[PDB]
Design an enzyme around this catalytic site. Structure first.
Site, mmCIF file in Angstrom:
data_model
loop_
_atom_site.group_PDB
_atom_site.id
_atom_site.type_symbol
_atom_site.label_atom_id
_atom_site.label_comp_id
_atom_site.label_asym_id
_atom_site.label_seq_id
_atom_site.Cartn_x
_atom_site.Cartn_y
_atom_site.Cartn_z
ATOM 1 C CG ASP A 1 -13.581 -31.722 -14.356
ATOM 2 O OD1 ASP A 1 -14.460 -31.832 -13.485
ATOM 3 O OD2 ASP A 1 -13.645 -30.870 -15.266
ATOM 4 N N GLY B 1 -21.063 -32.647 -13.799
ATOM 5 C CA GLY B 1 -20.319 -33.869 -14.042
ATOM 6 C C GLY B 1 -19.809 -34.611 -12.829
ATOM 7 C CG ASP C 1 -16.197 -30.359 -17.358
ATOM 8 O OD1 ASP C 1 -16.342 -30.529 -16.129
ATOM 9 O OD2 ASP C 1 -15.161 -29.867 -17.859
ATOM 10 C CD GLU D 1 -1.763 -25.224 -3.537
ATOM 11 O OE1 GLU D 1 -1.159 -26.045 -4.262
ATOM 12 O OE2 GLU D 1 -1.996 -24.052 -3.890
ATOM 13 C CG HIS E 1 -22.350 -26.346 -7.506
ATOM 14 N ND1 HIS E 1 -22.974 -25.216 -7.983
ATOM 15 C CD2 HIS E 1 -21.568 -26.798 -8.515
ATOM 16 C CE1 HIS E 1 -22.607 -25.005 -9.232
ATOM 17 N NE2 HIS E 1 -21.753 -25.949 -9.580
HETATM 18 O O1 LIG Z 1 -7.670 -21.856 -11.848
HETATM 19 C C1 LIG Z 1 -8.221 -22.901 -11.644
HETATM 20 C C2 LIG Z 1 -7.507 -23.985 -11.182
HETATM 21 C C3 LIG Z 1 -8.137 -25.160 -10.955
HETATM 22 N N1 LIG Z 1 -9.468 -25.280 -11.172
HETATM 23 C C4 LIG Z 1 -10.068 -26.570 -10.922
HETATM 24 O O2 LIG Z 1 -10.397 -27.191 -12.090
HETATM 25 C C5 LIG Z 1 -11.501 -28.023 -11.960
HETATM 26 C C6 LIG Z 1 -12.155 -28.172 -13.320
HETATM 27 O O3 LIG Z 1 -13.532 -28.384 -13.147
HETATM 28 P P1 LIG Z 1 -14.569 -27.382 -13.777
HETATM 29 O O4 LIG Z 1 -13.979 -26.010 -13.907
HETATM 30 O O5 LIG Z 1 -14.981 -27.900 -15.130
HETATM 31 O O6 LIG Z 1 -15.860 -27.322 -12.822
HETATM 32 P P2 LIG Z 1 -16.192 -28.471 -11.744
HETATM 33 O O7 LIG Z 1 -15.795 -29.811 -12.330
HETATM 34 O O8 LIG Z 1 -15.408 -28.217 -10.452
HETATM 35 O O9 LIG Z 1 -17.744 -28.469 -11.412
HETATM 36 P P3 LIG Z 1 -18.900 -28.318 -12.490
HETATM 37 O O10 LIG Z 1 -19.563 -26.990 -12.264
HETATM 38 O O11 LIG Z 1 -18.278 -28.392 -13.876
HETATM 39 O O12 LIG Z 1 -19.928 -29.423 -12.351
HETATM 40 C C7 LIG Z 1 -12.345 -27.302 -10.966
HETATM 41 O O13 LIG Z 1 -13.094 -28.193 -10.208
HETATM 42 C C8 LIG Z 1 -11.329 -26.579 -10.094
HETATM 43 O O14 LIG Z 1 -11.127 -27.319 -8.903
HETATM 44 C C9 LIG Z 1 -10.183 -24.192 -11.645
HETATM 45 O O15 LIG Z 1 -11.380 -24.267 -11.858
HETATM 46 N N2 LIG Z 1 -9.551 -23.017 -11.870
HETATM 47 MG MG LIG Z 2 -12.325 -29.008 -16.982
HETATM 48 MG MG LIG Z 3 -16.777 -30.274 -13.825
#
Ligand SMILES: O=c1ccn([C@@H]2O[C@H](COP(=O)(O)OP(=O)(O)OP(=O)(O)O)[C@@H](O)[C@H]2O)c(=O)[nH]1
Ligand SMILES: [Mg+2]
Ligand SMILES: [Mg+2]
Ligand SMILES: [Zn+2]
Length: 382
Positions: free
Chosen positions: A106, A161, A108, A41, A314
């Site tokens: 992950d 992060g 943060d 996916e 990003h």
């Molecule tokens: O509904 C969903 C499902 C999954 N995710 C996934 O959860 C992960 C949690 O990660 P974050 O939402 O904390 O952000 P990030 O790590 O991708 O990047 P930063 O801006 O924090 O540096 C995200 O990277 C995304 O791939 C969501 O954000 N939303």
């Molecule tokens: Mg998270």
């Molecule tokens: Mg993150």
């Protein structure tokens, strides 16, 4: 960096910079198992915040097309399912199942907001980034040494992060329960904002904590006592005093007022807490609370969790989700990580090795070294 050049920059990036080759090498895992890449996916986040998941592809070519065509702002990787995600509508309720996925973490910076003093929310600076260094060092050591996971890809998330992808064959088949159990093993800082003291240590210290403390010990003085200055003034050291028994507050409060800097005061904390032991591990609980990694259990629990793909862009910072060289982790700098405008700028200043000419190259090398070691393992060579 200007986020309005983004839709234009993406087009160039996705066509002449995104390393699809190494990318497909990764997700196909040497073709050993059929339909593996074909059942993976993906999810795309287009302009207008259009979000679509259950994207599947037949091969590397099919992937290259659909991405350049869709030109997504975000690319998330999901699980390997029982069927093709594309044809999920055709699958009966109960048979569409996420079956395998890398073990993912992950981390943060935002989750450290109660123990860092320089930034808050999505801001990072060099003074607080050391936390990520300690996070990577602490966790990777556990994944490598305690769990024996051999193929671990650490990635900068683009802003706040780092992610870690554990891709061992035996790992990708771990149930959600074992995944959740790995998180519990790695986790020490418990509690929300309602909870002041977030770390409590037993009289007996499990080796993981011991080894974790020792890594933190190596960074604590410069990070916590100098850069963060967690004992600068009363407003700050009261936060530390909240983590130790009341019966030593007064003695410490005075010693803090008579001392000049945090180094003096931390040493006082150490002596006083130590006496307190004699008649439990206050010094370490404080260091762990201020420096030990915070992990989102939800990201790592679920097999069907979609995590931001390596080499994604990003949308705000423009930085590339670039692999992190574990040997040069103390040297990693999230502020010199190439932006999409920068590697497109370099490509516009000169057919398959076009990326090697940009500043993106050394990071693709790391991804390749990650890929090489995977091949050897599938074969048998050490
Ligand atoms: O509904 C969903 C499902 C999954 N995710 C996934 O959860 C992960 C949690 O990660 P974050 O939402 O904390 O952000 P990030 O790590 O991708 O990047 P930063 O801006 O924090 O540096 C995200 O990277 C995304 O791939 C969501 O954000 N939303
Ligand atoms: Mg998270
Ligand atoms: Mg993150
Ligand atoms: Zn900071």
């Amino acid at each position: 960096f200007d986020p309005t050049e983004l839709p234009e920059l993406l087009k160039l990036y996705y066509r002449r910079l995104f390393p699809y080759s190494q990318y497909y090498r990764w997700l196909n895992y040497g073709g050993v198992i059929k339909n593996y890449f074909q059942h993976r996916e993906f999810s795309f986040t287009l302009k207008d915040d259009i979000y679509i998941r259950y994207q599947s592809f037949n091969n590397q070519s099919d992937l290259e097309k659909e991405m350049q065509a869709a030109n997504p702002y975000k690319i998330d990787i999901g699980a390997v399912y029982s069927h093709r995600p594309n044809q999920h509508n055709t699958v009966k309720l109960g048979a569409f199942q996420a079956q395998e996925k890398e073990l993912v973490f992950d981390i943060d910076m935002t989750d450290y907001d109660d123990v860092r003093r320089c930034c808050s929310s999505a801001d990072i600076c060099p003074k607080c980034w050391t936390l990520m260094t300690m996070a990577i060092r602490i966790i990777d050591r556990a994944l490598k040494e305690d769990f024996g996971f051999k193929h671990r890809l650490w990635v900068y998330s683009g802003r706040r992060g780092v992610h870690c992808w554990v891709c061992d064959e035996s790992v990708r088949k771990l149930s959600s329960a074992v995944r959740s159990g790995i998180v519990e093993y790695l986790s020490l800082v418990k509690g929300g904002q309602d909870v002041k003291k977030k770390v409590h240590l037993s009289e007996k210290i499990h080796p993981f904590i011991r080894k974790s403390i020792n890594i933190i010990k190596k960074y604590f003085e410069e990070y916590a006592l100098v850069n963060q200055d967690i004992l600068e003034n009363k407003e700050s050291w009261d936060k530390i005093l909240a983590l130790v028994p009341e019966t030593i507050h007064d003695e410490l409060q005075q010693s803090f007022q008579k001392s000049h800097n945090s180094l003096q005061r931390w040493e006082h904390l150490k002596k006083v807490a130590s006496r307190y032991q004699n008649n439990p591990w206050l010094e370490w609980e404080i260091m762990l609370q201020y420096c030990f990694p915070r992990l989102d259990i939800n990201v790592s629990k679920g097999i069907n969790h979609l995590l931001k793909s390596p080499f994604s862009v990003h949308p705000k910072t423009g930085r590339i989700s670039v692999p992190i060289d574990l040997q040069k982790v103390d040297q990693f700098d999230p502020f010199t990580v190439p932006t999409i405008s920068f590697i497109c700028r370099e490509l516009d200043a000169i057919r398959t090795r076009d990326y090697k000419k940009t500043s993106l190259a050394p990071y693709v090398k790391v991804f390749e070294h990650f890929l090489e070691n995977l091949d050897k393992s599938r074969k048998g060579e050490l």
